[PDB]
Amino acid sequence: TQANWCKGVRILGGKRDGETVLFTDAHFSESMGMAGGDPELVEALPMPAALRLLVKWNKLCEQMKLDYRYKLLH
Numbered sequence: 312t313q314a315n316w317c318k319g320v321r322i323l324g325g326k327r328d329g330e331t332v333l334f335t336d337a338h339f340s341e342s343m344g345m346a347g348g349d350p351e352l353v354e355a356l357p358m359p360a361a362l363r364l365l366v367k368w369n370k371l372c373e374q375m376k377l378d379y380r381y382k383l384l385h
């Protein structure tokens with residue numbers, strides 16, 4: 312429950328609006344642009360890593376002209 316840690320994201324808009332995605336071990340690697348890590352090991356990310364994934368994912372969402380977006384869990 313930190314300004315320094317973030318559990319995941321929630322989907323804004325679209326059919327899945329309100330759904331959450333909890334950050335996993337693999338997301339940390341993805342926040343570094345690396346493949347791997349366990350995608351089933353739930354764990355909070357350091358806020359900088361959370362932000363990196365936030366911006367990358369929403370850039371993709373507009374790149375792909377999608378109808379939903381991501382917001383960090385508070």
Ligand SMILES: [Cl-]
Pocket residue numbers: 357359360
């Ligand atoms: Cl980090």
